[PDB]
Ligand binder design. Structure first.
Ligand code: 3HB
Ligand code: 3HB
Lengths: 271, 271
Protein backbone atom coordinates (compact mmCIF):
# COMPACT_ATOMS: atom_id res chain seq x y z
CA UNK A 1 0.00 0.00 0.00
CA UNK A 2 1.46 3.34 -1.10
CA UNK A 3 0.74 6.76 0.41
CA UNK A 4 1.32 10.17 -1.11
CA UNK A 5 1.89 12.93 1.44
CA UNK A 6 2.06 16.68 0.92
CA UNK A 7 4.36 18.29 3.47
CA UNK A 8 2.64 21.54 4.27
CA UNK A 9 3.35 22.88 7.73
CA UNK A 10 -0.33 22.50 8.65
CA UNK A 11 -0.11 18.65 8.51
CA UNK A 12 3.10 18.48 10.59
CA UNK A 13 1.17 17.49 13.76
CA UNK A 14 0.05 14.37 11.86
CA UNK A 15 3.14 13.61 9.74
CA UNK A 16 6.25 14.62 11.68
CA UNK A 17 6.23 11.55 13.97
CA UNK A 18 4.42 9.15 11.63
CA UNK A 19 5.83 5.61 11.56
CA UNK A 20 4.63 3.56 8.61
CA UNK A 21 3.61 0.02 9.58
CA UNK A 22 5.12 -3.02 7.85
CA UNK A 23 3.95 -3.14 4.25
CA UNK A 24 3.24 0.55 3.66
CA UNK A 25 5.51 2.99 1.85
CA UNK A 26 5.15 6.71 1.32
CA UNK A 27 6.30 9.31 -1.21
CA UNK A 28 6.24 13.09 -0.92
CA UNK A 29 5.56 15.66 -3.60
CA UNK A 30 3.71 18.77 -4.73
CA UNK A 31 -0.12 18.81 -4.48
CA UNK A 32 -0.17 18.67 -8.29
CA UNK A 33 1.61 15.30 -8.36
CA UNK A 34 -0.25 13.66 -5.45
CA UNK A 35 -3.57 14.35 -7.20
CA UNK A 36 -2.13 12.76 -10.34
CA UNK A 37 -0.53 9.91 -8.40
CA UNK A 38 -3.78 9.00 -6.64
CA UNK A 39 -5.91 8.73 -9.80
CA UNK A 40 -3.33 6.82 -11.87
CA UNK A 41 -2.63 4.28 -9.11
CA UNK A 42 0.91 5.44 -8.36
CA UNK A 43 -0.34 5.80 -4.77
CA UNK A 44 -3.33 4.27 -3.01
CA UNK A 45 -3.98 7.05 -0.47
CA UNK A 46 -3.09 10.75 -0.37
CA UNK A 47 -4.14 13.97 1.31
CA UNK A 48 -5.70 15.84 -1.61
CA UNK A 49 -7.43 19.18 -1.87
CA UNK A 50 -11.13 19.35 -1.08
CA UNK A 51 -12.04 20.30 -4.67
CA UNK A 52 -10.08 17.32 -5.99
CA UNK A 53 -11.95 15.01 -3.62
CA UNK A 54 -15.28 16.57 -4.58
CA UNK A 55 -14.69 16.35 -8.35
CA UNK A 56 -13.80 12.64 -8.12
CA UNK A 57 -16.26 11.62 -5.38
CA UNK A 58 -17.62 9.01 -7.80
CA UNK A 59 -14.29 7.14 -7.58
CA UNK A 60 -12.85 8.30 -4.24
CA UNK A 61 -13.74 7.99 -0.58
CA UNK A 62 -12.20 9.93 2.29
CA UNK A 63 -11.08 8.80 5.71
CA UNK A 64 -13.95 9.55 8.13
CA UNK A 65 -11.83 11.33 10.76
CA UNK A 66 -9.00 13.22 9.01
CA UNK A 67 -9.20 16.76 7.66
CA UNK A 68 -7.31 19.98 7.21
CA UNK A 69 -10.11 22.39 8.13
CA UNK A 70 -10.49 25.69 9.93
CA UNK A 71 -13.10 28.09 11.30
CA UNK A 72 -12.21 31.74 10.80
CA UNK A 73 -8.83 32.92 9.48
CA UNK A 74 -6.37 30.29 8.25
CA UNK A 75 -3.43 32.72 7.58
CA UNK A 76 -2.05 30.53 4.76
CA UNK A 77 -4.73 31.06 2.07
CA UNK A 78 -4.26 34.71 1.24
CA UNK A 79 -5.30 37.25 -1.37
CA UNK A 80 -2.74 40.08 -1.26
CA UNK A 81 -4.05 43.24 -2.91
CA UNK A 82 -3.18 46.95 -3.23
CA UNK A 83 -6.72 48.11 -4.14
CA UNK A 84 -10.22 47.27 -2.85
CA UNK A 85 -11.73 44.06 -4.23
CA UNK A 86 -14.28 45.77 -6.58
CA UNK A 87 -11.29 47.51 -8.23
CA UNK A 88 -9.26 44.33 -8.84
CA UNK A 89 -8.58 43.86 -12.53
CA UNK A 90 -5.91 41.15 -12.59
CA UNK A 91 -5.14 38.47 -9.98
CA UNK A 92 -1.99 36.34 -10.15
CA UNK A 93 -2.17 32.65 -9.17
CA UNK A 94 1.10 31.26 -7.83
CA UNK A 95 2.39 27.68 -8.10
CA UNK A 96 0.16 25.63 -5.82
CA UNK A 97 -2.68 28.13 -5.53
CA UNK A 98 -4.88 26.40 -8.16
CA UNK A 99 -6.67 24.31 -5.52
CA UNK A 100 -7.95 27.45 -3.76
CA UNK A 101 -8.97 29.11 -7.02
CA UNK A 102 -12.36 27.44 -6.65
CA UNK A 103 -12.83 29.01 -3.23
CA UNK A 104 -11.61 32.40 -4.51
CA UNK A 105 -14.07 32.22 -7.41
CA UNK A 106 -16.97 31.28 -5.12
CA UNK A 107 -16.22 34.32 -2.97
CA UNK A 108 -15.74 36.58 -6.00
CA UNK A 109 -19.05 35.47 -7.56
CA UNK A 110 -21.03 36.14 -4.38
CA UNK A 111 -19.73 39.72 -4.53
CA UNK A 112 -20.46 39.94 -8.26
CA UNK A 113 -16.77 40.40 -9.10
CA UNK A 114 -14.79 38.82 -11.96
CA UNK A 115 -11.17 39.95 -12.25
CA UNK A 116 -8.99 38.19 -14.79
CA UNK A 117 -6.95 35.36 -13.25
CA UNK A 118 -3.47 34.53 -14.57
CA UNK A 119 -0.93 31.92 -13.61
CA UNK A 120 2.31 33.52 -12.47
CA UNK A 121 5.48 32.74 -10.50
CA UNK A 122 6.90 34.83 -7.67
CA UNK A 123 6.18 36.31 -4.29
CA UNK A 124 3.14 38.45 -3.60
CA UNK A 125 5.13 41.66 -3.18
CA UNK A 126 7.17 41.22 -6.36
CA UNK A 127 4.13 40.20 -8.44
CA UNK A 128 2.25 43.23 -7.11
CA UNK A 129 5.00 45.34 -8.69
CA UNK A 130 5.06 43.29 -11.93
CA UNK A 131 1.58 44.05 -13.28
CA UNK A 132 -1.00 42.58 -10.83
CA UNK A 133 -3.40 44.21 -8.36
CA UNK A 134 -3.98 40.93 -6.55
CA UNK A 135 -1.96 37.83 -5.77
CA UNK A 136 -3.24 34.51 -4.43
CA UNK A 137 -0.77 32.56 -2.26
CA UNK A 138 -1.26 29.33 -0.30
CA UNK A 139 0.75 27.16 2.05
CA UNK A 140 4.02 28.02 3.78
CA UNK A 141 4.87 30.92 1.45
CA UNK A 142 1.47 32.50 2.10
CA UNK A 143 2.05 32.33 5.86
CA UNK A 144 5.56 33.80 5.63
CA UNK A 145 4.43 36.54 3.27
CA UNK A 146 1.43 37.40 5.43
CA UNK A 147 3.85 37.86 8.32
CA UNK A 148 6.21 39.95 6.18
CA UNK A 149 3.38 42.33 5.28
CA UNK A 150 1.64 42.73 8.66
CA UNK A 151 4.42 41.95 11.15
CA UNK A 152 6.66 41.93 12.96
CA UNK A 153 5.03 40.86 16.19
CA UNK A 154 6.14 42.56 19.38
CA UNK A 155 5.94 41.02 22.89
CA UNK A 156 3.07 43.34 23.88
CA UNK A 157 1.11 42.49 20.70
CA UNK A 158 -0.43 39.13 19.80
CA UNK A 159 -0.81 37.26 16.51
CA UNK A 160 -4.57 37.75 16.43
CA UNK A 161 -4.30 41.52 17.08
CA UNK A 162 -1.99 42.15 14.11
CA UNK A 163 -3.42 44.45 11.41
CA UNK A 164 -4.49 43.07 8.05
CA UNK A 165 -2.64 45.81 6.14
CA UNK A 166 0.97 46.85 5.82
CA UNK A 167 2.99 48.93 3.36
CA UNK A 168 -0.14 49.60 1.31
CA UNK A 169 -0.90 45.86 0.95
CA UNK A 170 -4.07 44.28 2.33
CA UNK A 171 -4.08 40.56 3.13
CA UNK A 172 -7.54 39.09 2.67
CA UNK A 173 -7.86 35.64 4.31
CA UNK A 174 -10.14 33.40 2.23
CA UNK A 175 -11.10 31.21 5.20
CA UNK A 176 -12.29 34.29 7.08
CA UNK A 177 -14.14 35.41 3.93
CA UNK A 178 -15.76 31.97 3.88
CA UNK A 179 -16.82 32.42 7.49
CA UNK A 180 -18.27 35.88 6.69
CA UNK A 181 -20.20 34.30 3.80
CA UNK A 182 -21.46 31.07 5.43
CA UNK A 183 -20.78 31.13 9.20
CA UNK A 184 -19.13 27.70 8.85
CA UNK A 185 -15.71 26.00 8.86
CA UNK A 186 -13.84 25.45 5.62
CA UNK A 187 -12.32 22.05 4.82
CA UNK A 188 -9.19 22.40 2.67
CA UNK A 189 -7.97 18.81 2.46
CA UNK A 190 -8.98 15.23 3.18
CA UNK A 191 -7.31 11.81 2.97
CA UNK A 192 -8.68 10.12 -0.13
CA UNK A 193 -8.42 6.65 -1.64
CA UNK A 194 -10.17 4.76 -4.43
CA UNK A 195 -13.39 3.24 -3.08
CA UNK A 196 -12.33 -0.29 -4.05
CA UNK A 197 -8.98 0.01 -2.20
CA UNK A 198 -9.45 0.91 1.48
CA UNK A 199 -6.28 1.53 3.54
CA UNK A 200 -4.98 -1.11 5.97
CA UNK A 201 -6.11 -0.73 9.56
CA UNK A 202 -2.50 -0.60 10.73
CA UNK A 203 -1.95 2.55 8.64
CA UNK A 204 -4.96 4.33 10.14
CA UNK A 205 -3.84 3.45 13.67
CA UNK A 206 -0.30 4.71 13.09
CA UNK A 207 -1.79 7.92 11.65
CA UNK A 208 -4.03 8.43 14.69
CA UNK A 209 -1.14 7.79 17.07
CA UNK A 210 1.10 10.33 15.29
CA UNK A 211 -1.64 12.99 15.29
CA UNK A 212 -2.09 12.40 19.04
CA UNK A 213 1.65 12.86 19.57
CA UNK A 214 1.72 16.07 17.52
CA UNK A 215 -1.38 17.58 19.14
CA UNK A 216 0.11 16.71 22.54
CA UNK A 217 3.44 18.45 21.79
CA UNK A 218 2.52 21.49 19.76
CA UNK A 219 5.45 23.63 20.96
CA UNK A 220 7.95 21.01 19.74
CA UNK A 221 6.17 20.70 16.39
CA UNK A 222 5.90 24.47 16.07
CA UNK A 223 9.55 25.17 16.95
CA UNK A 224 10.91 22.88 14.22
CA UNK A 225 8.77 24.45 11.50
CA UNK A 226 9.16 28.07 12.67
CA UNK A 227 12.93 27.66 12.29
CA UNK A 228 12.49 26.36 8.72
CA UNK A 229 10.08 29.19 7.80
CA UNK A 230 11.90 32.03 9.60
CA UNK A 231 8.91 32.84 11.84
CA UNK A 232 8.39 33.24 15.60
CA UNK A 233 7.55 29.95 17.31
CA UNK A 234 4.35 31.47 18.69
CA UNK A 235 3.18 32.41 15.17
CA UNK A 236 3.46 28.80 13.97
CA UNK A 237 2.00 27.47 17.24
CA UNK A 238 -1.12 29.61 16.95
CA UNK A 239 -1.22 28.70 13.25
CA UNK A 240 -1.34 24.97 14.02
CA UNK A 241 -3.73 25.30 16.99
CA UNK A 242 -6.35 26.84 14.67
CA UNK A 243 -6.72 23.79 12.48
CA UNK A 244 -9.48 21.20 12.79
CA UNK A 245 -8.16 17.72 12.03
CA UNK A 246 -10.96 15.23 12.71
CA UNK A 247 -13.43 15.86 9.80
CA UNK A 248 -16.34 16.24 12.20
CA UNK A 249 -19.91 17.25 11.41
CA UNK A 250 -19.11 21.02 11.20
CA UNK A 251 -16.19 20.30 8.85
CA UNK A 252 -18.39 18.09 6.67
CA UNK A 253 -21.09 20.77 6.55
CA UNK A 254 -18.68 23.38 5.19
CA UNK A 255 -17.22 20.80 2.81
CA UNK A 256 -20.71 20.04 1.49
CA UNK A 257 -21.65 23.74 1.15
CA UNK A 258 -18.42 24.35 -0.74
CA UNK A 259 -19.07 21.31 -2.96
CA UNK A 260 -22.54 22.63 -3.87
CA UNK A 261 -21.31 26.12 -4.73
CA UNK A 262 -18.11 25.18 -6.54
CA UNK A 263 -18.97 21.78 -8.07
CA UNK A 264 -22.79 21.73 -8.41
CA UNK A 265 -24.06 18.27 -9.24
CA UNK A 266 -21.03 16.58 -7.69
CA UNK A 267 -21.30 12.90 -6.85
CA UNK A 268 -22.20 12.16 -3.24
CA UNK A 269 -19.34 12.65 -0.76
CA UNK A 270 -18.62 9.34 1.01
CA UNK A 271 -16.46 8.46 4.00
CA UNK B 1 -5.93 44.02 41.50
CA UNK B 2 -7.73 40.85 42.59
CA UNK B 3 -8.55 37.84 40.40
CA UNK B 4 -11.12 35.17 41.12
CA UNK B 5 -10.65 31.89 39.25
CA UNK B 6 -12.84 28.80 38.91
CA UNK B 7 -10.52 25.89 38.09
CA UNK B 8 -12.64 23.85 35.73
CA UNK B 9 -10.68 21.28 33.75
CA UNK B 10 -11.32 23.10 30.49
CA UNK B 11 -9.39 26.22 31.65
CA UNK B 12 -6.33 24.22 32.80
CA UNK B 13 -4.31 25.15 29.66
CA UNK B 14 -4.79 28.79 30.60
CA UNK B 15 -4.56 28.73 34.40
CA UNK B 16 -2.28 25.85 35.46
CA UNK B 17 1.00 27.66 34.72
CA UNK B 18 -0.20 31.22 35.30
CA UNK B 19 2.32 33.38 37.18
CA UNK B 20 0.68 36.49 38.60
CA UNK B 21 2.68 39.71 38.08
CA UNK B 22 3.50 41.85 41.13
CA UNK B 23 0.48 43.62 42.56
CA UNK B 24 -2.06 41.04 41.37
CA UNK B 25 -3.59 38.50 43.73
CA UNK B 26 -5.97 35.60 43.15
CA UNK B 27 -8.63 33.69 45.07
CA UNK B 28 -10.71 30.70 44.06
CA UNK B 29 -14.21 29.43 44.76
CA UNK B 30 -17.52 28.32 43.33
CA UNK B 31 -19.06 30.28 40.42
CA UNK B 32 -21.90 31.80 42.43
CA UNK B 33 -19.49 33.08 45.11
CA UNK B 34 -17.15 34.42 42.40
CA UNK B 35 -19.91 36.12 40.38
CA UNK B 36 -21.07 38.00 43.48
CA UNK B 37 -17.50 38.94 44.41
CA UNK B 38 -16.97 40.38 40.92
CA UNK B 39 -20.22 42.36 40.91
CA UNK B 40 -19.75 43.65 44.47
CA UNK B 41 -16.10 44.54 43.79
CA UNK B 42 -14.20 42.20 46.12
CA UNK B 43 -12.59 40.73 43.03
CA UNK B 44 -11.78 42.70 39.90
CA UNK B 45 -11.72 39.99 37.20
CA UNK B 46 -13.11 36.45 36.94
CA UNK B 47 -13.92 33.73 34.42
CA UNK B 48 -17.72 33.65 34.50
CA UNK B 49 -20.33 31.73 32.57
CA UNK B 50 -21.75 33.21 29.40
CA UNK B 51 -25.15 33.74 31.05
CA UNK B 52 -23.61 35.58 33.97
CA UNK B 53 -21.78 37.94 31.61
CA UNK B 54 -24.83 38.41 29.38
CA UNK B 55 -27.15 39.18 32.32
CA UNK B 56 -24.72 41.79 33.70
CA UNK B 57 -23.44 43.25 30.44
CA UNK B 58 -24.70 46.64 31.64
CA UNK B 59 -21.78 46.81 34.07
CA UNK B 60 -19.32 44.12 32.87
CA UNK B 61 -17.05 43.96 29.85
CA UNK B 62 -15.16 40.89 28.67
CA UNK B 63 -11.55 40.42 27.68
CA UNK B 64 -11.46 40.50 23.85
CA UNK B 65 -9.01 37.60 23.51
CA UNK B 66 -10.08 34.91 26.05
CA UNK B 67 -12.94 32.40 26.02
CA UNK B 68 -14.09 28.89 26.70
CA UNK B 69 -15.95 27.97 23.53
CA UNK B 70 -16.38 24.94 21.29
CA UNK B 71 -17.72 23.99 17.86
CA UNK B 72 -19.56 20.69 17.82
CA UNK B 73 -19.59 18.32 20.79
CA UNK B 74 -18.14 19.45 24.11
CA UNK B 75 -18.43 16.06 25.97
CA UNK B 76 -18.92 17.69 29.38
CA UNK B 77 -22.45 19.07 28.91
CA UNK B 78 -24.61 15.99 28.51
CA UNK B 79 -28.26 14.98 28.57
CA UNK B 80 -28.33 11.22 29.27
CA UNK B 81 -31.59 9.54 28.30
CA UNK B 82 -33.16 6.12 27.77
CA UNK B 83 -36.10 7.33 25.63
CA UNK B 84 -36.46 9.85 22.77
CA UNK B 85 -36.51 13.49 23.80
CA UNK B 86 -40.23 14.05 22.95
CA UNK B 87 -41.14 11.25 25.40
CA UNK B 88 -39.32 12.82 28.35
CA UNK B 89 -41.77 14.00 30.97
CA UNK B 90 -39.01 14.91 33.45
CA UNK B 91 -35.28 15.67 33.35
CA UNK B 92 -33.17 15.32 36.48
CA UNK B 93 -30.65 18.03 37.40
CA UNK B 94 -27.86 17.13 39.79
CA UNK B 95 -25.99 20.43 40.15
CA UNK B 96 -26.73 24.13 40.14
CA UNK B 97 -25.71 25.47 36.71
CA UNK B 98 -27.61 28.45 35.35
CA UNK B 99 -25.46 28.12 32.22
CA UNK B 100 -26.32 24.61 31.17
CA UNK B 101 -30.00 24.87 32.12
CA UNK B 102 -30.42 28.07 30.08
CA UNK B 103 -28.82 26.22 27.15
CA UNK B 104 -31.02 23.16 27.73
CA UNK B 105 -34.14 25.35 27.90
CA UNK B 106 -33.20 27.16 24.68
CA UNK B 107 -32.83 23.83 22.90
CA UNK B 108 -36.06 22.43 24.35
CA UNK B 109 -38.20 25.48 23.50
CA UNK B 110 -36.90 25.44 19.92
CA UNK B 111 -38.27 21.87 19.64
CA UNK B 112 -41.55 22.61 21.43
CA UNK B 113 -40.62 20.24 24.28
CA UNK B 114 -41.29 21.00 27.92
CA UNK B 115 -40.25 18.23 30.35
CA UNK B 116 -40.23 19.18 34.00
CA UNK B 117 -36.79 19.88 35.44
CA UNK B 118 -36.26 18.40 38.91
CA UNK B 119 -33.34 18.54 41.30
CA UNK B 120 -32.12 15.06 42.19
CA UNK B 121 -29.11 13.31 43.70
CA UNK B 122 -26.95 10.68 42.05
CA UNK B 123 -25.07 9.78 38.93
CA UNK B 124 -26.60 9.68 35.48
CA UNK B 125 -26.78 5.89 35.66
CA UNK B 126 -28.26 5.55 39.15
CA UNK B 127 -30.91 8.19 38.35
CA UNK B 128 -31.79 6.48 35.06
CA UNK B 129 -31.96 3.08 36.78
CA UNK B 130 -34.31 4.76 39.30
CA UNK B 131 -37.26 7.03 38.49
CA UNK B 132 -35.91 9.12 35.57
CA UNK B 133 -35.47 8.72 31.83
CA UNK B 134 -33.49 11.95 31.42
CA UNK B 135 -30.53 13.38 33.38
CA UNK B 136 -28.45 16.51 32.77
CA UNK B 137 -24.80 16.40 33.84
CA UNK B 138 -22.05 19.03 33.47
CA UNK B 139 -18.32 19.20 34.11
CA UNK B 140 -15.95 16.44 35.16
CA UNK B 141 -18.85 14.17 36.20
CA UNK B 142 -20.47 14.59 32.78
CA UNK B 143 -17.18 13.80 31.02
CA UNK B 144 -16.51 10.75 33.20
CA UNK B 145 -20.05 9.42 32.82
CA UNK B 146 -20.07 9.94 29.05
CA UNK B 147 -16.95 7.76 28.91
CA UNK B 148 -18.53 5.19 31.23
CA UNK B 149 -21.45 4.93 28.80
CA UNK B 150 -19.87 4.95 25.34
CA UNK B 151 -16.38 3.66 26.06
CA UNK B 152 -13.87 2.49 26.41
CA UNK B 153 -11.17 3.51 23.93
CA UNK B 154 -9.15 0.79 22.21
CA UNK B 155 -6.06 1.00 19.98
CA UNK B 156 -8.43 1.11 16.97
CA UNK B 157 -11.31 3.23 18.31
CA UNK B 158 -10.70 6.94 18.99
CA UNK B 159 -12.65 9.55 20.92
CA UNK B 160 -14.18 11.04 17.75
CA UNK B 161 -15.35 7.62 16.52
CA UNK B 162 -17.02 6.45 19.73
CA UNK B 163 -20.80 5.95 19.52
CA UNK B 164 -23.16 8.31 21.29
CA UNK B 165 -25.14 5.40 22.79
CA UNK B 166 -24.24 2.64 25.19
CA UNK B 167 -26.21 0.06 27.22
CA UNK B 168 -29.41 1.58 25.85
CA UNK B 169 -28.38 5.06 27.06
CA UNK B 170 -28.10 7.91 24.58
CA UNK B 171 -25.70 10.75 25.46
CA UNK B 172 -26.99 13.93 23.84
CA UNK B 173 -24.31 16.66 23.74
CA UNK B 174 -25.81 20.11 24.24
CA UNK B 175 -22.99 21.82 22.32
CA UNK B 176 -23.57 19.50 19.36
CA UNK B 177 -27.30 20.24 19.71
CA UNK B 178 -26.42 23.94 19.62
CA UNK B 179 -24.46 23.41 16.40
CA UNK B 180 -27.41 21.49 14.88
CA UNK B 181 -29.62 24.45 15.79
CA UNK B 182 -27.39 27.39 14.82
CA UNK B 183 -24.37 26.11 12.86
CA UNK B 184 -22.16 28.13 15.19
CA UNK B 185 -19.85 27.74 18.21
CA UNK B 186 -21.12 27.96 21.76
CA UNK B 187 -19.25 30.14 24.25
CA UNK B 188 -19.46 28.78 27.79
CA UNK B 189 -17.29 31.33 29.58
CA UNK B 190 -15.56 34.69 29.27
CA UNK B 191 -13.14 36.67 31.44
CA UNK B 192 -15.23 39.53 32.80
CA UNK B 193 -14.40 42.74 34.66
CA UNK B 194 -16.29 45.87 35.67
CA UNK B 195 -16.16 48.46 32.89
CA UNK B 196 -14.63 51.07 35.24
CA UNK B 197 -11.76 48.80 36.15
CA UNK B 198 -10.00 47.06 33.23
CA UNK B 199 -7.07 44.77 34.10
CA UNK B 200 -3.42 45.85 34.05
CA UNK B 201 -1.43 44.97 30.95
CA UNK B 202 0.98 42.78 32.93
CA UNK B 203 -1.86 40.44 33.94
CA UNK B 204 -3.06 40.02 30.34
CA UNK B 205 0.52 39.40 29.23
CA UNK B 206 0.92 36.79 31.97
CA UNK B 207 -2.34 35.09 30.98
CA UNK B 208 -1.28 35.03 27.32
CA UNK B 209 2.07 33.47 28.19
CA UNK B 210 0.37 30.88 30.40
CA UNK B 211 -2.06 29.95 27.61
CA UNK B 212 0.80 29.51 25.11
CA UNK B 213 2.57 27.15 27.53
CA UNK B 214 -0.61 25.14 28.11
CA UNK B 215 -1.57 24.88 24.43
CA UNK B 216 2.05 24.09 23.53
CA UNK B 217 2.16 21.18 26.02
CA UNK B 218 -1.28 19.55 25.92
CA UNK B 219 -0.12 16.04 26.79
CA UNK B 220 1.48 17.41 29.97
CA UNK B 221 -1.65 19.37 30.97
CA UNK B 222 -3.93 16.45 30.11
CA UNK B 223 -2.02 13.79 32.06
CA UNK B 224 -2.35 15.75 35.31
CA UNK B 225 -6.12 16.19 35.01
CA UNK B 226 -6.67 12.73 33.47
CA UNK B 227 -5.12 11.07 36.54
CA UNK B 228 -7.26 13.22 38.87
CA UNK B 229 -10.40 12.24 36.90
CA UNK B 230 -9.65 8.54 36.42
CA UNK B 231 -9.69 8.93 32.63
CA UNK B 232 -7.28 8.01 29.83
CA UNK B 233 -4.82 10.78 28.99
CA UNK B 234 -6.18 10.58 25.41
CA UNK B 235 -9.68 11.56 26.58
CA UNK B 236 -8.62 14.71 28.41
CA UNK B 237 -6.20 15.62 25.62
CA UNK B 238 -8.83 15.55 22.89
CA UNK B 239 -11.29 17.20 25.27
CA UNK B 240 -8.91 20.13 25.79
CA UNK B 241 -7.76 20.30 22.16
CA UNK B 242 -11.40 20.69 21.24
CA UNK B 243 -11.86 24.06 22.98
CA UNK B 244 -11.58 27.53 21.42
CA UNK B 245 -9.81 29.94 23.74
CA UNK B 246 -9.50 33.25 21.86
CA UNK B 247 -13.10 34.72 21.67
CA UNK B 248 -12.88 35.26 17.92
CA UNK B 249 -15.72 36.42 15.66
CA UNK B 250 -17.40 32.97 15.39
CA UNK B 251 -17.32 32.66 19.21
CA UNK B 252 -18.88 36.11 19.70
CA UNK B 253 -21.53 35.29 17.10
CA UNK B 254 -22.46 32.15 18.99
CA UNK B 255 -22.47 34.16 22.22
CA UNK B 256 -24.73 36.91 20.85
CA UNK B 257 -27.18 34.36 19.41
CA UNK B 258 -27.34 32.62 22.78
CA UNK B 259 -27.76 36.03 24.44
CA UNK B 260 -30.74 36.83 22.19
CA UNK B 261 -32.53 33.53 22.87
CA UNK B 262 -31.77 33.03 26.56
CA UNK B 263 -31.58 36.61 27.88
CA UNK B 264 -34.00 38.67 25.73
CA UNK B 265 -33.46 42.40 26.13
CA UNK B 266 -29.88 41.98 27.41
CA UNK B 267 -27.56 44.96 27.40
CA UNK B 268 -25.09 45.09 24.52
CA UNK B 269 -22.12 42.73 24.90
CA UNK B 270 -18.92 44.80 25.00
CA UNK B 271 -15.26 43.79 24.84
O1 3HB C 1 -3.32 22.55 3.45
C1 3HB C 1 -3.07 21.34 3.23
O2 3HB C 1 -2.58 20.59 4.11
C2 3HB C 1 -3.38 20.75 1.87
C3 3HB C 1 -3.13 19.48 1.60
C4 3HB C 1 -3.48 18.96 0.21
C5 3HB C 1 -4.02 19.77 -0.69
C6 3HB C 1 -4.30 21.23 -0.34
O3 3HB C 1 -4.87 22.13 -1.26
C7 3HB C 1 -4.01 21.67 0.85
O1 3HB D 1 -16.47 26.02 31.46
C1 3HB D 1 -15.91 26.92 32.16
O2 3HB D 1 -14.66 27.06 32.16
C2 3HB D 1 -16.74 27.86 33.02
C3 3HB D 1 -16.18 28.88 33.65
C4 3HB D 1 -17.05 29.80 34.50
C5 3HB D 1 -18.35 29.56 34.61
C6 3HB D 1 -18.98 28.37 33.88
O3 3HB D 1 -20.35 28.10 33.97
C7 3HB D 1 -18.24 27.58 33.14
Amino acid sequence: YRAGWIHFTNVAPILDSLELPPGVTAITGVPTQMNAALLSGEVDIANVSAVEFIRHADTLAALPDFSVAVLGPVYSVNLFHTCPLPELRRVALTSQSAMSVALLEVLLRQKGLSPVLERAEGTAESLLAAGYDGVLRIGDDALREWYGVVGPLTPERTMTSLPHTGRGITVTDLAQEWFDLTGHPFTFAVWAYRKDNPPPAALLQAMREARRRGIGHLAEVSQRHAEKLGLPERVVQHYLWNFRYHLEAPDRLGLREFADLAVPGHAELTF
